[PDB]
């Protein structure tokens, strides 16, 4: 093999092993192995990476070489003739609200997290990629087919920049080319954190002895605080709205403010670290501020990974569930922890989760104001219809009470997302998620859709009648297949989410198998797990059972109006109670003694 020690982490830490609290950048968790699940370090490979040339150029740089034989077809085609649609009336998911997509992408970011390259502090090839089209070391452009729109408004093609690998950041040579995880591989609310020192220390109020997060000194919520603005210029939340010059918010994980809702997500999560450090000085009012924040942070990780496991992953996987997650038996130091190079494209299923419209309701969960729903597309990197207008209680109200997109196999991503993304770089609002999706499995080196299939035991298409039994729909399959050519030239990202959905799921079998063992994984390789004895006491974990995503709104927004179970689909009034019968987390057990 290659080297087995290489890598450009952060350098200089050591572990203290008897020390009761996670590291921030993921280290020490596992003692025989420290570097294993630690932020910026390789995604995990499950199976050998595949490259034009074996070792990093993706496949569809080279238009004379072939993949099997056949050309691999653009990105932007296949998103045009497969995953477009029109009409957005019946998508809705008749029963998952819409927090069960913004859930999945609160997870995701605590998990995954690969940044594009870089080496121009005042590039010019960086203009090179987006005025001219010209492919060529880190530019990997997606180039527009044939009779697209965009040729006639926007140009040849989309800017797109490899992402970023291990060991350097130079061209190279080597072992072939691994992607990097800016983030740790621990459900641990890494996004809230932070996942380096650096970033983890300018979140911190350390102007005060009480373990509290830094919050927005300009803006304010009824008297609930929001998040430091970043003020680091120029802004992409500033550019959308030259005149409101209101910057993006900072948070432990940078993509934050990419959509309205996420940001919303990540304020009632630093809201709930301060209400917690807040309680915990009542009742131990000795505990210094770097005990505040530890247990605070210590305790918000147990939340998500609780509201996680027991609440969002049984809906995702369904009948699968207990298939590739069976009941906790304790921490495993044999297992891999680390985030694999294809989940991080499997868990982009819900991109097709995501509906064209984004509501604010007001306190009898009706229409707020004029204006009361709008567009996704004008919400991306948008914080200014935040502070400027009515704060997040009226997008919490829509979280609760509007639905998540349904995958269809003949409506998979909303125009918003697949003809009007807005990238924090450029300035239009004319980007195609669904094309870049694609255009990342190849950058990856992601093997095929058969490749998995067989990896998860399951059957391998090889005739289009195959692919169609499969499929369980003719005419996705044959589109799929005049592109394709060969089921094993099927990108993993739409291979994957054209599977019919298991029962009680959201994904197909592919997908609940690539999903279920990352997740069984890190839990079952996580030191710090919950329930794992040791971490917290058993009077703890009772309190620790009671959390619920509704309660975490009830104490930190002026909603009083929520439902039970809020990731199935919920309609008001019926389904909805007062804020004092959901239950509340008790902290006594927290109570510390010192004689
Ligand atoms: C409107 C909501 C969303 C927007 C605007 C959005 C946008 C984006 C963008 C621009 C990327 C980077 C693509 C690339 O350069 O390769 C991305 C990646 C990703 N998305 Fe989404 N996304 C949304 C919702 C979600 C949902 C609901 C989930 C999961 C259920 C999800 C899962 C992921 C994952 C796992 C990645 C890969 C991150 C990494 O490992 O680097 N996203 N998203
Ligand atoms: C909308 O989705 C709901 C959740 O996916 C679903 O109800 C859930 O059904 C499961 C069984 O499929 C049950 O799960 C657990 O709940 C019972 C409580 O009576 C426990 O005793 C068992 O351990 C069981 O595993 C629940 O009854 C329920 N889950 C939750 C969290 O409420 C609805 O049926 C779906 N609605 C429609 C119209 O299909
Ligand atoms: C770090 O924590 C500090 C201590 O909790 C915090 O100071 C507190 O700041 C708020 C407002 O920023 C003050 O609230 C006061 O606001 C009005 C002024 O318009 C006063 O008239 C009221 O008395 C009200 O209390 C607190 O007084 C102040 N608390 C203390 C003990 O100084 C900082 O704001 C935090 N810093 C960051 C960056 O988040
Ligand atoms: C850029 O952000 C601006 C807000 O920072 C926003 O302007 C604001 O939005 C509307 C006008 O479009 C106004 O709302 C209503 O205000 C009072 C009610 O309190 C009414 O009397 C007005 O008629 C109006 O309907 C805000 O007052 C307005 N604020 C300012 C300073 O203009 C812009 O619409 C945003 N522009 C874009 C392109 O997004
Ligand atoms: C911890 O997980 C490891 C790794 O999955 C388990 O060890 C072995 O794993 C291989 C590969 O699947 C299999 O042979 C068995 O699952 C295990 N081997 C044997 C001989 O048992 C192991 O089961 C787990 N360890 C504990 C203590 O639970
Ligand atoms: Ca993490």
């Known amino acids: 093999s290659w080297e087995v020690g290489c890598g450009a982490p952060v350098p200089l830490v050591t572990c203290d092993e008897q020390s009761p609290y996670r590291t921030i950048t993921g280290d020490c968790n596992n003692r025989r192995s420290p570097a294993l699940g630690a932020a910026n370090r390789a995604l995990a490979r499950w199976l050998p990476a595949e490259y034009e040339d074996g070792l990093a150029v993706p ?102 920049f490899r992402a970023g690998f291990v060991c350097p950041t130079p061209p190279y040579q080597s072992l072939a080319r691994d992607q990097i995880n800016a983030v740790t591989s621990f459900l641990d609310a890494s996004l809230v954190y932070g996942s380096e020192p650096s970033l983890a220390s300018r979140l911190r109020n350390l102007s005060s002895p009480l373990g509290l997060m830094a919050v927005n000194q300009e803006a304010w919520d009824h008297g609930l605080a929001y998040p430091p603005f970043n003020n680091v210029k120029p802004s992409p939340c500033e550019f959308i709205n030259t005149t409101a010059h209101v910057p993006c918010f900072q948070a432990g994980d940078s993509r934050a403010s990419e959509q309205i809702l996420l940001a919303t997500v990540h304020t009632l999560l630093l809201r709930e670290h301060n209400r917690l450090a807040r309680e915990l000085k009542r009742l131990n009012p000795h505990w210094d501020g770097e005990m505040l924040y530890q247990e605070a942070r210590k305790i918000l990780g147990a939340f998500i990974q609780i509201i996680t496991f027991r609440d969002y992953l049984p809906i995702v996987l369904g009948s699968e569930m207990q298939k590739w997650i069976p009941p906790y038996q304790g921490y495993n130091n044999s297992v891999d922890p680390r985030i694999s190079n294809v989940f991080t494209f499997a868990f982009r299923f819900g991109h097709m989760e995501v509906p064209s419209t984004v509501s604010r309701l007001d306190e009898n969960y009706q229409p707020w104001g004029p204006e009361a729903e709008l567009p996704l597309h004008t919400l991306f990197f948008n914080t200014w219809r935040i502070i400027k207008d009515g704060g997040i209680d009226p997008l919490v109200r829509g979280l609760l009470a509007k639905n998540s997109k349904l995958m269809n196999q003949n409506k998979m991503v909303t125009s918003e997302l697949r003809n009007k993304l807005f990238q924090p770089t450029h300035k239009v609002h004319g980007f195609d998620l669904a094309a870049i999706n694609l255009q990342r499995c190849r950058d990856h080196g992601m093997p095929g859709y058969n490749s998995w299939r067989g990896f998860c035991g399951l059957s391998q298409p090889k005739t289009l009648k195959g692919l169609q039994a499969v499929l369980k729909n003719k005419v996705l399959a044959k589109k799929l297949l005049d592109l394709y050519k060969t089921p094993d030239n099927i990108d993993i990202w739409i291979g994957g989410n054209a599977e019919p959905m298991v029962e009680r799921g959201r994904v197909g079998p592919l997908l609940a198998c690539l999903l279920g063992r990352q997740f069984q994984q890190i839990r079952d390789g996580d030191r710090f797990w919950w329930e794992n004895p040791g971490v917290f006491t058993e009077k703890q974990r009772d309190s620790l059972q009671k959390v619920s995503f509704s309660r975490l709104i009830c104490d930190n927004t002026h909603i009083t109006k929520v439902p039970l179970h809020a990731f199935q689909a919920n309609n008001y009034p019926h389904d909805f109670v007062d804020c004092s019968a959901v239950d509340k987390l008790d902290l006594s057990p927290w109570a510390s003694r010192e004689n």
């Not at 740089?61 to 003739?81: C, D, H, I, M, Y």
């Not at 998508?91 to 605590?110: A, E, K, P, T, Y």
């Not at 005042?122 to 987006?130: P, R, T």
């Not at 010209?134 to 006639?152: A, H, R, S, Y």
């Open 59 to 160: 496949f569809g740089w080279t238009q004379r070489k072939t993949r099997n034989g056949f050309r691999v077809p653009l990105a932007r085609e296949v998103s045009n003739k497969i995953v477009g649609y029109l009409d957005e009336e019946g998508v809705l998911d008749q029963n998952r609200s819409l927090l069960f997509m913004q859930w999945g992408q609160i997870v995701d970011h605590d998990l995954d997290f690969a940044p594009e390259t870089e080496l121009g502090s005042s590039e010019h090839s960086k203009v090179q990629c987006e005025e001219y089209c010209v492919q060529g070391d880190e530019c990997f452009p997606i180039m527009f087919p044939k009779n697209d729109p965009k040729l006639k408004t926007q140009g040849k093609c989309m800017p797109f």
